[PDB]
RNA sequence: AUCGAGAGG
DNA sequence: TCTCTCGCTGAGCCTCTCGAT
DNA sequence: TCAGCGAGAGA
C-alpha cells in the first residue's frame, strides 16, 4: 500500500449496534503511524503506533 | 474361500471382536508350541489354518478351555 | 513400532526367532511429558 | 503396574527430594574441555555419567565395577540412559511467584484474596512476592470459610475454591516458588554439529539467564547493598522466572539472536507442536513405506500389488529369520549381506514370506473409517503401488499423481485384526448409512448400460435364442448386433420357498447384451434387475439387493464380475468425445433476448425512484437464474430426444446414442450443469462472499468466450479455490471438536429395559418425500404401540428390530408414525446399551458389545463438510442459486389443511396469513398426509379452508423480495414518533408517482432518537383509539429499520391492507461452505441474540410461544424435556445437510446430542452430599439417587444443562483428555489446584499412556481387569 | 531440530 | 440490575526440495 | 486478521 492518507470504515461489524465506524490513517514511507477513529459515542480518538 | 472372507468363520462364534480365540491361543500354540494342526495344512501359513478350523467347527472357546484342563492334569 | 526402547529390541529378536509375540511397555514420550511437567513445578505421578 | 494418575502442587521439600545432585550455582554449560564442566547445566555429579559404564574421572570403566562412586570427581557409574531421568534444583534468594497461578485464568491468588488482579500485579512488580507469601500464610481457611458462610455469584466461587484447598491438602504458601526444578540434560540436548560450534536450544539460555540473575541477587545481598538498588533486580529475577516457564504472558517476550520469541517450558506442552498433539496422539512408525498409486485392473477385491523393492525392505527381519531357519546363513550379518547382494534365494524366501501377511494402506487425509484398509499383497515389478479400481471411491483416491502409505502388521493378533476387521472384503457398507461404498463408476457403467441399452432395427433383431450362451456366440461371431431386440429362454432361481431355491424357465423379450449380462449374476435373483438400461443407481441397487438376499461372498464375486464385464465391454464399445458431439439449440438466443428485455425493464424501473437497489439486485438475479434453467432444459431436451431411425421404411424416434448424452445419462462422470455449460449459457458466477449479476455469459465452451466474459468468469474460479483452501481448516476444526467431545461412550450392555423413545414420522419438503418412513426406522428397535391401524390388534410385538421385511410389512399397512427408543433416553451408566442404539450400519445386524459409537458418529458428521468443501471447484464456481417460489401449486388432489394459523379476511375475501409459522399440509381423501408447505407472512389463499382442490391449482401468492406488515383492524392511520432527521427521512421525487418515507435504521439513528420508538397506530375517525376485537390494548405496529411507507396520515384503510414493506437481504449462493457455520453454531449452542419468549409456567400452556422469533435450544430443553431439543437439533442439522444431498443417519447426531448434555444443576440437596445449585455429572447423581432410594431416604431433584461441544469436552471427569484437547494451561493449573485424580476410563487416556483401548478386542481385557477388582 | 521460501496430494 | 471496553483462546492432514543460521 | 466468550467496568 502506498504512503499517504487513507479513509476506511469497519462496515458496522465492530459493535452490535451496526453503526459504521469511519477512520483515517496516515501511513508514511518511514516513520510512525497515526490514526483518527470514532467510537459509537461519536468522539474523535487519535492512535499513535 | 476362507482366505477371502471370514463370515462363515464368525457365524460359529457370533461375535466379530472375539478373534482373541483364533489368534491368542490357537495360532500361538501352533506357532510356538508343539500342537499339531487338525485340518490338512495345504501349505497355508498359520492363522489361516485356525480360521479354517473355527469355520468347519473344531475350535471354540469351550473346546480349547476343556483341552487346556485336560493337559492341566499331569 | 516406535517410542519404546525395550519393546523394539524384544520384538525384533522375536520376529527373527519366528515368534510373533510382543511385550509392550510404556512409551518414552509419556516419560518426557511427565518429567517436563514435574520440572514446571506441578507434581504428577503414577499411583498403584 | 499402575491404575491412576495423581496431580497436585509440589511442596519445596518434594522438589528438594527430587534432585540427585547438590546445587546449581555456576551458570556454565561446557567448552572448558569436551568433557562437561562441573556443576553446569550439563554435569556429571548431578545428572550422571556421560559415557556408558564409564565414569568421567576415568578410574574404572568396567560393568564388574558398577555400583561404585568415583574418587577424583565423585560420579557414580551407571548406564548413560539415567541422564534421561535425574533432576536438580536451584535455590532462589527471593521467592518468586508462579505466573500460571497469578495469570492465564481467573487468578487463584486473586480469588484467595479479595482485592482484584491489578492490585496484586502492581504489588508483585514493585510498582514484592514475599508480601504475597506472608499474606497467603496469614489466613486460616476454616475461619474465613465459616465467615463467608455467615454472610450467606463470586462468594460461591471463593468458598468452593477454599473448600478445594481444604479437601485437597494444598497449602497456599506452595503457590509461591522457593526452589526451582530443572529438566534432565538429555531432555534438552546439546546437539552436535558438523562445525566447531554447537547448536543451543532455547531452554538452556533461559535457564542460564535465571541462574545469572539469581546469583547476582546472592552476591549483592551479601555485600549489604542499599535498599534502593536491591529491589530493582528482584523485579528482573521475577521477569526471568516468568520467561523460563510460560514466556510471553507478561508482555515483551524475550527474543534471542534473531527476532523470534524464545520457546519456554509451557510451549512444549500446548499448541500444535506440543507433546500432546505431536508425540502422543500421533507418532512416526517403523516398518512402513510410501509411494504413488496406479490402477492395475487385473486384481481381485482383496488384493493389492506392491513393488519388490518395497517388500524386500519392509519384510527384512522375517527374511533374516527364515534364512537362519533354512540353514543358508549362520549369523545375522551373513543373512544381511545376502539381502544386500539380492541373490535368488532371497527372492524365493520373500515370495514365501509375503504369502498371507496383509498390509494396511492409507491415504493422506483420513476423513473417515474407510480411509485405511487391509489388503493381501502381491509382488509386482515396478515402483508404484497398484490399487483395486472399486476401492478408490472409498479412499477418494484418483490417479493424478496421488500417493499412499503402507504399514505392515507385526504380531499374530495384528494379522488377525487386519484380516477380520480391516480387510476390504468386510467393508461393503459405509458406517454412516445403509448404502454400499464399492459402487462401479466411470468406465464400468459406461460399458454396462451400453451392453443393456437397446436399438431399433439393429442387426439380428427379431430372433429366438436358446439362452445366454447362444447370445454370446452370436455377438462374438458377428451374426447379430449387441443392441438387437430378441426373445431368450432364460431360467431364474428364486428363494421364495422356505430355505430353498426353486427354478422357473420362460421366454422373455430382452436384448442380446442383457442376455450376456445375465450370465454373471448369482443364483437366486430376479431377471428384472438386468432387463433395463443400467445406470449408476441401478447397479448400486443391484449390489444392495445381492447383499440383502444372498449374502457377502456372492456379493464380492458379483462385484468382481461386474467390474470385469464393464471394463471389457467399455473397451469394445469404442465410445469417444468429439467436437461434433456437442449440439447447440436455437431457442437459446430467443430466451436470452427476452430475459435481456426483462432486465432492461427492471433497470428502467430502478431508474425511477419507485424501487431500491437491493430489490432490483434480487429481481435481476432471479430473472437470470430462471433463464439459465430454461436454456438448460431446452438444450437437454434437444440432446435427449433428437435421434430418428427408420424401421422397414418408416421413420421412428428413439433415445439418442450421442456420446455426450450417453455420458450424462449414465451418471458415470458429469452432471447436467457441465453439459448445460458446454451447450447453453455458463450462467451466473459467485464471488468468494456472494453472487455477482454483471452480465449474462451468452457463450458456450464450444464457441469461445471473449475477453470480458472470461474476466467475469475468473471470479468464480478464485472463489472456489479460496473456499477450498480456506474452509478445509474450519471443517477439520469442527471434526476434531466432535471427535474430542464424543470419544468416550461405547456399548456396554445388551438391554437397559426402558420404554420411552422419540416418535419418527415421514418428512417431506413441498411435494417430494426426501426421506420416507422406511429408512427413518430401518434398523431401529420399536419402543411402544406400533400396532397397525386396527383397534386392539398389534401388527408387530414390542422391542423388536425392524428388518427389510418388517419395513415392507409397515409400508403395506401404511403406518403413519412409530415411537422408537433412542440413545439419548437410555438409563445405562458410562455408556449406551446395544438395543437402544439399534443396528450398526456397517455390518447389517444389531450392534455388538464394545464398538466405539462416538468416534464413528463424529467421523460420519465430519467427513461430508470437508469433502464437499474440497469438491467446490469441480462445478467451476457457478452460483448455486435457485429462484425463490412466488406461489404454491399442489401436485396431487386432496383436502386442504392449515396448521397453527392466525389469519384475517381482507376486502377481496382471500385468507391473508398473519402468523409467522403458518404451515400448509396436503392430505389425501383417505386421510394420509401427503405434502407439506411453509406459508410466509402475508400470503393470500384463493380457496377457503375445507374445500377440495384439484391438481395444478394455485393455493397462495406472495412476494418473496419484501416482507409486508398487515393491518389487523380497519380504521384511520395516524403517524406516531416520526421526526425527520432523527428517526425517519423524507424525500419527494421529481416525477415518479410516489413520495415515500423511509424509516431510519437503529444504527444510523442519533443518540437523542433512541428513546423514541417509531410506530404506526390506527385511530378512529373521531380521533379516539380503535378497539381490537377482544383486546384491552389498541392496535399499533412497530415499524423496524429499512421500512418504506407510501401512505399519508389521515387515510382510511381497508382490513388486511399492507402499509409498509421491508426489503429482504439477498443471501445468495446457498452452498456447503455457506451452511457449515450454521452447523458449527448449532453444535456449539450459541445464543440466537434475539431469543423468542416462551411461557415458563402454564396457566397459556407450558412451552407455548408468546412473541415469535428464533427459539434458543436452552429454552426448548428447560420447557419441553430432552426429547424436544433432540428433535430440534436433529431436524435443523438434517435441514442444513439435506440441500447438498449428503445422507447422514440420525443416530449419530443423537449420540452427539446426548454427549453435549451431561451436566445437571441440583435445586434441592435432599439427603445427599451435594449442596445447593451446583453443576455436577448426571450419572453420579443417578447412582446417588438410586442408593438413597435403596436406603429409604430422600433423593435429590435436578435440572439438565446444555453445553457446547467445546465446553462439554473441556469440562469432563478426566483431565488428561481436557489437557490434550486445548487450553492446556487452564486445565492443568485447575487440576493441580484441585488435586484431581484420573482413572484412565476413555480412549485418549489409554492411547497416550500406551495400553489397550476399552473397545473392540481390548474390551475383554478391560472387563477381566475390572472383574478382578 | 528451527526459520524462511517454494511444490505436490 | 445491566450494557459496554478490554484480553485471551482458537483457527485440517500428509509428503518433497533448497538455503542459513 | 475475524469470531466468540467471560470478567469488569460504570449508568
Ligand atoms: O489443500 C488441499 C488440496 C488437495 N487435497 C486432496 O486432493 C484432492 C484434490 O486434488 P486432486 O487434483 O488430486 O483431486 P480432483 O480429482 O478433484 O482434481 P482434478 O483431477 O479434477 O483436477 C482433495 O480431494 C484432497 O484429498 C487436500 O486434502 N488439501
Ligand atoms: N543447524 C545449524 N544451526 C546452526 C549452525 N550454526 C549455527 N547454528 C545455530 C546455533 C544457534 O542457535 C544459532 C547461532 O547463529 P549465529 O551465528 O547468529 O544458530 C549450523 O551450521 N547448523
Ligand atoms: Mg488426485
Ligand atoms: Zn573418581
Ligand atoms: Zn438403553
Strand order of the largest sheet of chain A: 1-2-3-4
What compounds sit in this structure?
uridine 5'-triphosphate, 2'-deoxyguanosine-5'-monophosphate, magnesium ion, zinc ion
Order of helices and strands of chain A: EEEE
Shape of chain D from CA axes? Answer: globular
The oligomeric state is part of a larger assembly
Query: In angstroms, what separates the terminal alpha carbons of chain A?
Result: 17 Å
The helix count of chain D comes to 40
User: Helix/strand/pairing class of chain D, anyone?
Assistant: alpha+beta
How much of the polypeptide of chain A forms β-strand, as a percent range? 35-45%
Query: What is the number of strand segments of chain D?
Result: 42
CATH class of one domain in chain D: Mainly Alpha
Helix content of chain D: 25-40%
Fold and architecture overview:
The structure is cut from a larger assembly and holds two copies of chain A, one copy of chain B (74 residues) and one copy of chain D (1269 residues). Chain A has 49 residues and is mostly beta strands. In chain A, 0% of the residues lie in helices and 41% in strands. In chain A, strand 2 and strand 3 form a beta hairpin. Chain A is elongated and about 35 Å long. By secondary structure, chain B is mainly α. In chain D, helix 18 (443-452) crosses helix 22 and helix 31 packs across helix 34 (1146-1156). Chain D has a domain at 579-720: Topoisomerase I, Chain A, domain 4. The chains are: A mainly beta (49), B mainly alpha (74), D alpha+beta (1269). At the C-D interface, helix 1, helix 2 and strand 1 of C face strand 1, helix 1, strand 3, helix 13 and helix 38 of D. The structure holds uridine 5'-triphosphate, 2'-deoxyguanosine-5'-monophosphate, magnesium ion and zinc ion (ZN) (2 copies). Residues 752, 754, 826, 828, 833, 835-836 of chain D line the site of one zinc ion. The structure holds three DNA and RNA strands. It is classed as transcription/dna/rna.
